[PDB]
Structures are given as structure tokens and as C-alpha cells.
Design an enzyme around this catalytic site. Structure first.
Site, PDB file in Angstrom:
ATOM      1  N   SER B 167       0.845  -1.184   0.000  1.00  0.00           N
ATOM      2  CA  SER B 167       0.000   0.000   0.000  1.00  0.00           C
ATOM      3  C   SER B 167       0.885   1.241   0.000  1.00  0.00           C
ATOM      4  CB  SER B 167      -0.922  -0.011   1.215  1.00  0.00           C
ATOM      5  OG  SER B 167      -1.798  -1.124   1.169  1.00  0.00           O
ATOM      6  N   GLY B 168       0.576   2.193  -0.883  1.00  0.00           N
ATOM      7  CA  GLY B 168       1.480   3.315  -1.100  1.00  0.00           C
ATOM      8  C   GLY B 168       1.745   4.121   0.157  1.00  0.00           C
ATOM      9  N   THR B 172       4.137   4.274   5.649  1.00  0.00           N
ATOM     10  CA  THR B 172       5.058   5.295   6.125  1.00  0.00           C
ATOM     11  C   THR B 172       4.616   5.841   7.475  1.00  0.00           C
ATOM     12  OG1 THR B 172       3.962   7.214   5.139  1.00  0.00           O
ATOM     13  CG2 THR B 172       5.308   5.846   3.691  1.00  0.00           C
ATOM     14  N   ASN B 212       1.772   1.441  -8.980  1.00  0.00           N
ATOM     15  CA  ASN B 212       2.336   2.234  -7.893  1.00  0.00           C
ATOM     16  C   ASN B 212       3.197   3.329  -8.510  1.00  0.00           C
ATOM     17  OD1 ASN B 212       3.343   3.216  -5.434  1.00  0.00           O
ATOM     18  ND2 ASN B 212       3.391   1.159  -4.536  1.00  0.00           N
ATOM     19  N   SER B 215       7.626   1.962  -4.823  1.00  0.00           N
ATOM     20  CA  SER B 215       7.450   0.628  -4.259  1.00  0.00           C
ATOM     21  C   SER B 215       8.785   0.097  -3.759  1.00  0.00           C
ATOM     22  CB  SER B 215       6.848  -0.327  -5.290  1.00  0.00           C
ATOM     23  OG  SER B 215       6.296  -1.466  -4.656  1.00  0.00           O
ATOM     24  N   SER B 216       8.818  -0.326  -2.498  1.00  0.00           N
ATOM     25  CA  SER B 216      10.008  -0.934  -1.907  1.00  0.00           C
ATOM     26  C   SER B 216      10.173  -2.333  -2.477  1.00  0.00           C
ATOM     27  CB  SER B 216       9.890  -0.978  -0.389  1.00  0.00           C
ATOM     28  OG  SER B 216       8.885  -1.894   0.009  1.00  0.00           O
ATOM     29  N   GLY B 438       3.810  -6.965  -0.263  1.00  0.00           N
ATOM     30  CA  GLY B 438       2.688  -7.859  -0.136  1.00  0.00           C
ATOM     31  C   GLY B 438       2.485  -8.711  -1.374  1.00  0.00           C
ATOM     32  N   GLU B 440       0.921 -10.003  -4.931  1.00  0.00           N
ATOM     33  CA  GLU B 440       0.703  -9.316  -6.191  1.00  0.00           C
ATOM     34  C   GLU B 440      -0.224 -10.139  -7.066  1.00  0.00           C
ATOM     35  OE1 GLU B 440       4.702  -9.424  -7.489  1.00  0.00           O
ATOM     36  OE2 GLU B 440       5.193  -7.448  -6.670  1.00  0.00           O
TER      37      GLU B 440
END
Lengths: 185, 714
Positions: B167-168, B172, B212, B215-216, B438, B440
Site C-alpha cells: 500500500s502506497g 510510512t 504504484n 514501491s520498496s 505484499g 501481487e
């Protein structure tokens, strides 16, 4: 819904969709099996190759025609060839298309009986029909009257037609064709 | 009573008794209010004849009887009687409408990004959770952090925090708020220190994904350390497996890591001239496969943020220009061109301009580079002999070199940051903060998606093991005799065929080593080994109108389809030790610092799997605590969530797995007094000896346990 046309023949399968101008798939009616050993572990050996895949690997295969003189003499191989024709060449589902098979005149009844049984059971076609090759040749020639000499790979036959009426007592079937010429050569 | 000390935030944390007691007496029927599917909502209330603004008549074993209004705002769905998709969906919808973005889910912690500033975090007036348990306070994650504190102090065992992160946002802010909480409890702070150099990770391990824009592509496992008695110490972060295949290959409408484009923003011409590089991205292949730029972000400000990060870090001029040189050299790799030697099978160079650039940059020789690439050498016993090479093999070597350069540079920056945030007395205990991508499910799934799904599969089986053992403990506690097949492992042990050295990825490497192997041959081998012999392995339903898949697996997040085109190029990593020796001597001191410390087989699958197992061992020695962030709507407006998006999320978030498993209870476990009082209309021995099935309950030590679908009658 469109229908399939599957002129079998004893040397070449010609399949396609009813309404086109030319068969969509034309490949040899042949089934090959490996005769040699097989050493490379993990090469993914297939049990048998059909069509023109068996034609490029023919150096190591033993080729067999499941149709000798217009008669289907190996029903497992013929089922393999039909499965190939439907799924790999035409890429359709036989459950959604009526199929028009073709046969030569004056050949055993069990041939057509097994054809229709195979279709309806192991392919679940909605409907089917078995025509005579000479009549279709006359359709394509754009006529309703004439004596047509059909000569394929297995059998040569004449069928005289007049005004759209066949003369079944004058049909003459001869059993030398392309394959006997190949052997003589 | 115990909530009014949260004041203006009490309304958010737990409503006053009045609206709740008037909500516990709503007139609703169990046989005239069900849930039916829908096209825009996929799930709606109704009155088989059904009307709620739209009428349909469907089968009577597909409707979902709505929950009783006794429970219509409870923050923990583990006590409801009708556990099904729309139940939880509209329950969260309602508890989010009447603003309470926090929720308990069995063992998870589902929170939703409110898009609205709320004093539910500040000041400490709400952070008074000190000493309490999770069960008694309102369902705040700070209570979870306090429980983690209590546990780590009372057992001297490390703890773990696993949040869903793709989730964007919400990732954070949640990380920030929890780390602030930990700073407060065990008291230019360490949070300032963390968020100082975070642009490093943002620019190296993040790229525009098709769904996104930041994305990490790696795992962030923050270790925040505590004193032996429970005073916070310095905190060292740990990084893990990275989607490094991104270095070379990128799909359409995506791009690799930002730093390339940040540099390419033509902001500081000193760099673009030191790297002898232009500004056109379409001239360097390793980045110009998908899109060269996304208009949702500017690159100049990103370059400046990264420069600031390098400055606040201990980097010198060399510890910045050298990294720029490494990135530039990786980019100049992308257009190295070679041809077969005339009349024979050997790669020969054509043009060496890029070779000159790279040799100057890394502190290497052009001729040495070219020959060592074109003439690999092996240690055969006690001798040296050269190896011939086809062009594709040398291209594999080039790609592997670039990948390894980038990967070790990344890891070294990780160690540098961990050092720069470390100065503290000898410590003992810590809390694990595991951030991870997460699940995909895109419209075109590929190999990297298979990797990520396998990672998430392992993590979900891990969670299931944890919840299984905790439930088994609780059942042993009340003397409740009930045993079952392990919910934690067995149901998923069969979907990890991918790891068994005959499964999907195993056969993948097998083909990578197999000569002349093609994706068709690979598909053939797959179908040989798994078609029909596996229930989870199935043929995809390719109906014309979509891109073709080649196989389908049933995970916990539905049934996934993949397209195997191009996977040999993704997995092969034949490393060239000759150029490794070249690196280990380079004049560019950063290169030597990277590669300081009687080969042709390395697969991305192997390293990926081993790093995954390493992280799994890292976890299984600790105690976990889970978090589930949700983005309610894509238009970012507060108050309303779009139900199909959130429903797909919650499907992939895995909480539905916990629901499905607690359905195998007895999820409803009540005391004697509460049920005795609430249902006295005529000690619990007589009350339930009156009436249904006698397995519906398990009486033990003032505890009654109920299977889902029983309290919809009461």
C-alpha cells in the site's frame, strides 16, 4: 456458429473453417515414433510425433500412415491426428463446431460408423456429416453435371453426376494412387 | 468509564455507552436480511426474492445472512456468528464510516489510512496505554507496541512486527508513529536519524511499478534495540533479498530503480560529464525497456534529496562520486556490443567507446576487460586454462556483473548507514520491525511475481503456524479437549512444490543447465511433472481477450496464472570470476572496498530461495506481531472506501485466511456469566442442558466456545 471442414485423405490432412477460400492447415497425415535409444537425460522425449513435426524429426522416427487405401486401419493414430488437427493446428474447441468429414465411395460401413462414434464421443461435436469427395469436387468446380476423376494418395475413383443426380451403379473405384506410384518409383 | 480519559479521542477509540446500547437493540431479522453478490458492490444487504435498490432472485445457498445488530460495531470480528466475506467487509465499512480506523482481527491489527489528521496519536493523553494489555484498551496499535514491550521484558525474547507494505501510504505513517512510540516509552532522535538517510533506500530500492509510483522492492527489517532492563539503545536496520533482475530487464510501462533517472534529470552536469553520459534515456538499454519517466514525480528534487542524504551521511566526495561512477558504469554496460568472430563461434567486439568509458570509470583496463569477458579462465586442479564463449554467454556475464556490482554497492551502503546510526553501550534485546512487499495479482503475472508470491506464501504459512500454536495453547488452557490437523503448516505445505527439488523453480534451473532449452521445452517438462499429479497445479483458462498464461497455481490468495515467456533470461547468472579478479584490484578504492573479500551455475532462484530461508530463520527465533494497513480508496478522499479494491486487498492481505481458520473453531469463546445473563429467558450446565447440537459448546473453567453460525439464532 461456424463449422469445420476436415478433408482427411490418405496422405494429407486439409482442415479449415467453412467459408474460407483455402484450407487453413495442410500437413502430412502421419505419425512417427522413435526407434533409436535416447541418451541425453532430460531432453524431454515425446512418445510420438504427428503432422509435420514428425516430418522434420523423421531421421530418427519410423513413420506410419493410419490410412492405407482410404480406409482407416489404425484408430488410435487417427485419433491422435484428429486431436492434433483440432487443438494444435486449428486451435479451436471441437465442442463448439459442427464438423464435415469426407470419405471415398465404396469403402466399408464400419469406417463411417467409427468416424461418427469417435467424433460424438471423444470430441463431443454438436453435429457432423460425412460427404463424398467427388461431389464436393464438383461443387468446387462450379458445375452440376460431369464425371469427376478424383485421385489422391490412396484411391482413384470416378463418379458421374447429371443435373445433381448421382449414378451409383456407374461409380468405379480403383486402388492405385500417389502412394503406389511412389513405391514404383 | 475507562475511556473518557481519551477525551476528544475517546470518540474515535471507543464510543460512549449510549450510542452502543441503542445500537445493540436494533430491530433486525435473521430470515429477511441476507447478503447477495453485486456488480458494483459485489456484496449487498437484501430482503430468492431480494431487494435493496436492485432486485435479483438467486440460489438460497449463496446468500450470506447479515450479522446480528448486537455486534454491529465490535472492533474484533472474532466474536461474530456469521463469518463471511461481506460480513467483515461491511463491518469494516461501518466502523470506518463512524470514524474508528482501528480494528482487531483475531491476531492481526487492521488499520485504515484516514487521509485526515487525528489527535488519536497525540498527545500522550492517548499514549497512556502504559501497562495495559491488548484486550482491555481500545484497539490501538500503540497498545500492541506496549504489549511487545511487556513481552520482550518479561521473557527476554526478541519480538517481531510484520506490516503489509505494498500500500502506497499508511506504511510510512504507521512506521513513523510506532517508532515514535518506542522512542517515547523506553526513553536529533533515533527517528530523526532513521528518516535522515532514508532517501538512500528510497532511491536505490524503489521504482515505478505499474500499480504504484514508489514501491520498496526489498525487505526492511528495523532492529530497534533495548537495554538489558528496557531502555532504548541504538537501532541497526537489516536489509534482505532485492529484486535485482530489475537491473537489466524491465517490462512495459515500468522502470528500474530511481537513482538512474534521478541522475539522468540533467540537474548537475558535473556528474553527467564525469560519467561521459548523455541525458537521453533511450540510449542506455538497461533502463530504457519500459518507460523513461513518470510524470507523477520530478527527478531534480529527488536528486537534491539524495544529495542531502549523502551529505548528512558520512560520505566524502569519493563516497558520492564513486557511487555515481558505479551507476554510470552499470548504465554504460547496457550498450556493449559484440559480434561472432568471422567464420567461427566466438564473440568479438565492435566498437569500444563504452568499453573506454567503463575502463576509465571503474579504474580498469579496456583491453583487460574485453579479453577477460571474451576469454573466461578456470582453476582446473592446479592449472589455468581459458574457456571459449558464445556471444549470449558473454552477455549473460555482463548482466551478472552489473547485477553483482549494484547488489554489493547496495549492501555496503546498508552497512554504512547502520554504522552511522550506531553509537551506544552494550545492549541485549530489541524489537523487530519487518516491512515487506505484499502479494501481487496483476493482469500479467511474471517470474518476479512468482518470487514475491512465494515469499508471501512462506510468511503467511509462518503466521499460520504462529496462530495455530497460540490457539492450541489457549485450548489447552481451559482444559478444552480438542485436537486437529495443524492449521499452521499442512494446508500450505502442499503449495510449496516450487521449493521441492522437483517442482517449478527446480525444473526451471534444471532447464537453465539443460542445453538448447526453450520455454516450450520448459512448459513440456512442467506439464510432465505436475499436470494432473498435482491438485494445485492446473491449466489456465485463456479466453481470447486477455494475454495468455501457461499454468495456474492455487495459492491462499486465490488461483494465480503466470506466463513463462523469458524466464531463462531472468534466472541465469553465470558469474565471470576473471572480471571479479579485475574488480578486486581496481584503482577506484570504492570498488576494492566492495569486492575485498584442492560459478557458471548461479541462478537467481537459488539466491532468492536461500535469502528467503535466511529471513525465515531470522523470524522463527522470535515472537511475531502483525499489522495490516489498508488504503480505503484510490481517489484518496476520506470517509468512504471503494469496496472492490479494499476487498481484493483484504483477500491478499491474508486476514481472510485467519477468518477461514477461526471458522474451524469455536472462534466465539465466551464466559459463563455473560451468556447466562444475556440468554436467561426460561450454572451454564442447566442453561445449555435445555437445548441444536452439544458439540456447539465446550464447557470449561467458566468458558463457553461457539462455532460460527450459532449466535445468529440467539
Amino acid at each position: 456458429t461456424t463449422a469445420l471442414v476436415c478433408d482427411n485423405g490418405s496422405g494429407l490432412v486439409k482442415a479449415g473453417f467453412a467459408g474460407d477460400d483455402a484450407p487453413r492447415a495442410v500437413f502430412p497425415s502421419i505419425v512417427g515414433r522413435p526407434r533409436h535409444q535416447g541418451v541425453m537425460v532430460g531432453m524431454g522425449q515425446k512418445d510420438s510425433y504427428v503432422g509435420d513435426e514428425a516430418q522434420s524429426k523423421r531421421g530418427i522416427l519410423t513413420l506410419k500412415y493410419p490410412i492405407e487405401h482410404g480406409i482407416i486401419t489404425n484408430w488410435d493414430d487417427m485419433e491422435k491426428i484428429w486431436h492434433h488437427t483440432f487443438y494444435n493446428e486449428l486451435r479451436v474447441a471441437p465442442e463448439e463446431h459442427p464438423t464435415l468429414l469426407t470419405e471415398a465411395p465404396l469403402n466399408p460401413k464400419a469406417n463411417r460408423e467409427k468416424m461418427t462414434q469417435i467424433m460424438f464421443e471423444t470430441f463431443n461435436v454438436p453435429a457432423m456429416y460425412v460427404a463424398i469427395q467427388a461431389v464436393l469436387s464438383l461443387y468446387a468446380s462450379g458445375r452440376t453435371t460431369g464425371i469427376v476423376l478424383d485421385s489422391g494418395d490412396g484411391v482413384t475413383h470416378n463418379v458421374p453426376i447429371y443435373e445433381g443426380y448421382a449414378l451409383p451403379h456407374a461409380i468405379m473405384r480403383l486402388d492405385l494412387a500417389g502412394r503406389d506410384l511412389t513405391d514404383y518409383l | 468509564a475507562q475511556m473518557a480519559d481519551f477525551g476528544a479521542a475517546a470518540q474515535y477509540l471507543r464510543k460512549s455507552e449510549k450510542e452502543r446500547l441503542e445500537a445493540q437493540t436494533r430491530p433486525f431479522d435473521i430470515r429477511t436480511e441476507c447478503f447477495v453478490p453485486d456488480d458494483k458492490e459485489e456484496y449487498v444487504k437484501a430482503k430468492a426474492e431480494t431487494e435493496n435498490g436492485k432486485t435479483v432472485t438467486i440460489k438460497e445457498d449463496q446468500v450470506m445472512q447479515q450479522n446480528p445488530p448486537k455486534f454491529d460495531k465490535i472492533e474484533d470480528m472474532a466474536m461474530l456468528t456469521f463469518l463471511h466475506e461481506p460480513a467483515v467487509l461491511y463491518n469494516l465499512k461501518e466502523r470506518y464510516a463512524a470514524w474508528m480506523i482501528y480494528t482487531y482481527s483475531g491476531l492481526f491489527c487492521v488499520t485504515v489510512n484516514p487521509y485526515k489528521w487525528l489527535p488519536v496519536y497525540n498527545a500522550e493523553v492517548v499514549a497512556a496505554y502504559r501497562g495495559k494489555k491488548r484486550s482491555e484498551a481500545p484497539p490501538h496499535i500503540f497498545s500492541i507496541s506496549d504489549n511487545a514491550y511487556q513481552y520482550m521484558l518479561t521473557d527476554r525474547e526478541n519480538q517481531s512486527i510484520l506490516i503489509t507494505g505494498e500500500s502506497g501510504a499508511g506504511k510510512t505513517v504507521n512506521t513513523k508513529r510506532v517508532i515514535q512510540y518506542f522512542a517515547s516509552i523506553a526513553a536529533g532522535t533515533l527517528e530523526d536519524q532513521i528518516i535522515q538517510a532514508n532517501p538512500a533506500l528510497e532511491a536505490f530500492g524503489n521504482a515505478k511499478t505499474v500499480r504504484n509510483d514508489n514501491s520498496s522492492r526489498f525487505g526492511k527489517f528495523i532492529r530497534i534495540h533495548f537495554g538489558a532492563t528496557g531502555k532504548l539503545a541504538s537501532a541497526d536496520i537489516e536489509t534482505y533479498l532485492l529484486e535485482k533482475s530489475r537491473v537489466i530487464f524491465q517490462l512495459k510501462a515500468e522502470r528500474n530503480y530511481h537513482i538512474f533517472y534521478q541522475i539522468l534529470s540533467n540537474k548537475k552536469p558535473e556528474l553527467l560529464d564525469m560519467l561521459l553520459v548523455t541525458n537521453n534515456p533511450y540510449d542506455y538499454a538497461f533502463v530504457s525497456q519500459g518507460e523513461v519517466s513518470v510524470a507523477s514525480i520530478d527527478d531534480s528534487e529527488e536528486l537534491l534529496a539524495t544529495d542531502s542524504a549523502f551529505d548528512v551521511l558520512s560520505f566524502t566526495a569519493e563516497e558520492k562520486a564513486g557511487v555515481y561512477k558505479l551507476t554510470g558504469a552499470i548504465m554504460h554496460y547496457g550498450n556493449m556490443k559484440f559480434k561472432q568472430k568471422q567464420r567461427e563461434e566466438q564473440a568479438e567486439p565492435d566498437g569500444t567507446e563504452d568499453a573506454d568509458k567503463s575502463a576509465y570509470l571503474m579504474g580498469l583496463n579496456s583491453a583487460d576487460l574485453l579479453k577477460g569477458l571474451c576469454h573466461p579462465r578456470v582453476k582446473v586442479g592446479n592449472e589455468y586454462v581459458t574457456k571459449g564463449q558464445s556471444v549470449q554467454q558473454v552477455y549473460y556475464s555482463i548482466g551478472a556483473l552489473a547485477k553483482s556490482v549494484y547488489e554489493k554497492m547496495f549492501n555496503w551502503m546498508v552497512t554504512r548507514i547502520n554504522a552511522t546510526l550506531e553509537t551506544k553501550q552494550p545492549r541485549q534485546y530489541f524489537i523487530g520491525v519487518l516491512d515487506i512487499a505484499g502479494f501481487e495479482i496483476f493482469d500479467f503475472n511474471s517470474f518476479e511475481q512468482l518470487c514475491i508470491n512465494f515469499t508471501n506464501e512462506k510468511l503467511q504459512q509462518f503466521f499460520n503456524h504462529h496462530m495455530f500454536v497460540l490457539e492450541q495453547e489457549e485450548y489447552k488452557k481451559e482444559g478444552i479437549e480438542w485436537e486437529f490437523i495443524d492449521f499452521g503448516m499442512d494446508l500450505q505445505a502442499c503449495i510449496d512444490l516450487i521449493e521441492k527439488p522437483m517442482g517449478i523453480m527446480s525444473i526451471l534451473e534444471e532447464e537453465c543447465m539443460f542445453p538448447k532449452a526453450s520455454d516450450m521445452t520448459f512448459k513440456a517438462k512442467l506439464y510432465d511433472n505436475h499436470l494432473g499429479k498435482s491438485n494445485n497445479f492446473q491449466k489456465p483458462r485463456n479466453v481470447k481477450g486477455k494475454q495468455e498464461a501457461h499454468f495456474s497455481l492455487v495459492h491462499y490468495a486465490g488461483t494465480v496464472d503466470y506466463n513463462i515467456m523469458g524466464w531463462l533470461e531472468k534466472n541465469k547468472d553465470p558469474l565471470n570470476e576473471t572480471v571479479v579478479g579485475l574488480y578486486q584490484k581496481s584503482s577506484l578504492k570504492l570498488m576494492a572496498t566492495l569486492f575485498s573479500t584442492k560459478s557458471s551455475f548461479q541462478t537467481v532462484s537459488a539466491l532468492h530461495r536461500e535469502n528467503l530461508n535466511k529471513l525465515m530463520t531470522n523470524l522463527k527465533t522470535t515472537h511475531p506481531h502483525f499489522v495490516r494497513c489498508i488504503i480505503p480508496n484510490e481517489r484518496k478522499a476520506p470517509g468512504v472506501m471503494d469496496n472492490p479494491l479494499v476487498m481484493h486487498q483484504l483477500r491478499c492481505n491474508g486476514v481472510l485466511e485467519g477468518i477461514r481458520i477461526c471458522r474451524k473453531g469455536f472462534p466465539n469463546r465466551i464466559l459463563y456469566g455473560d451468556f447466562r445473563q444475556r440468554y436467561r429467558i426460561l450454572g451454564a450446565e442447566k442453561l445449555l442442558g435445555s437445548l441444536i447440537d452439544h458439540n456447539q459448546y465446550k464447557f470449561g473453567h467458566t468458558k463457553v466456545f461457539f462455532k460460527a453460525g450459532l449466535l445468529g439464532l440467539l
